[PDB]
Structure 1
């Protein structure tokens, strides 16, 4: 799986994932499913931010904590949107709302509720993807066009298929915890 991750994801995503794991004392060479999951999540966030009009989204995920909060606080100050308790993933300048993105190995509805429960926000939009083509977004409002969403859904399916071909998928699929 470590070899899979390093050949599947671009070096910027892999570096960010390694850093995120080491910040919690986790070794990417040992907790390789986690390594894969973090990379997938980052890749989805960046894909999502590329799917709108130029300048539609601000990326928050993947930034160091200080810069992430600087971005969040700046946006809150200039738009008056409520300050979230936890860092979200993106800000949507069109809809004027923060976005929390999730990618799940279980099922989109359970992950959606867990995420709703964690952030406890009246205002932050949630969008969840699976590796088998399901999605689930707050108020069935999927933000992006069918084409952009299809690209994300296809990418995750492709990752799943590659894992399966290497006999990595069944361990990976069963590795997410409530």
Structure 2
């Protein structure tokens, strides 16, 4: 129950997650590990978005922190940390000007390097069978996709990746530590009323 894991993450994670599961979910059974899925997801998305501003050209440079500087356009606006009335709103208001393909299902990010969306979800073990489901789901979602693994295997479409590849290892450490404590405690990788 991640209220002890609350000592690890900034409270904004749970601030967003409890507000998100409010309408669709609860905290009666196995939510703090569903909170853990959500926290890994949101944390890695934010972790990218935190320090990438774009130059005249794409391929964002990593930037110092807390710095009022020339470039503020960060490459990836967060769509996952919003309510539907803003998520669908922003995906429409993008699909209209700078014409893209509003996808049949939900997005996570959108950049100005490739001018397309990104999917960043995670799966626990080998994705040899679940990349199939992901593929039959957001069919031809022509925004860069990249599944993940609770062990550390990475691969994506177009044989091309996002940006600097030390973040590869840093997300590997993110996940590695997460499980580490998981293995320490969890079994890591095992009607109306009136």
TM-score, normalisation: structure 1: 0.83
Provide closer, same or farther for how the CA distance between residues 155 and 15 of structure 1 changes in structure 2, counting only shifts above 3 A.
same
Higher relative contact order (CA 8 A, sep 6+): 1
Whole-angstrom distance in 1 between the partners of 2:133 and 2:192 = 12
Q: CA RMSD in A?
A: 5.1
- After TM superposition, the structure 1 stretch with the greater mean CA deviation from structure 2, 129-138 or 20-29, is 20-29
In structure 2, distance between residues paired with 1:154 and 1:107: 18
C-alpha displacement at 1:43, in angstroms? 0.9
Deviations 1:18-42 (A, max 9, x none): 2222222331664332121111111
Provide, for residues 41-65 of structure 1, a one-character-per-residue CA deviation record: whole Å limited to 9, x for no partner: 1111112323xxx521121111111
- Report deviation, 1:4: 4.3
Question: Alpha-carbon deviation of 1:116?
Answer: 1.8
Measure, in 1, the Cα distance between the counterparts of 2:7 and 2:192.
Answer: 22
Q: 1:157 Cα shift?
A: 1.0
Aligned equivalent of 2:138: 119
Aligned residues: 172
Contact kept? 1:49, 1:90, Cα under 8 Å: no
More off after superposition, 86-95 vs 111-120: 111-120
Determine if contact 1:41/1:103 at 8 Å carries over to the other structure.
Answer: yes
What is the match of residue 132 of structure 1? 151
Unaligned runs of 5+ in 1: none
Which structure is higher in strand share? Answer: 1
Unaligned runs of 5+ in 2: 51-72
Partner Cα distance (2:47, 2:113) in 1: 17
Q: Which has the larger radius of gyration?
A: 2
CA distance in 2, matches of 1:159, 1:40: 8
Q: TM-score scaled to structure 2, two decimals? A: 0.76
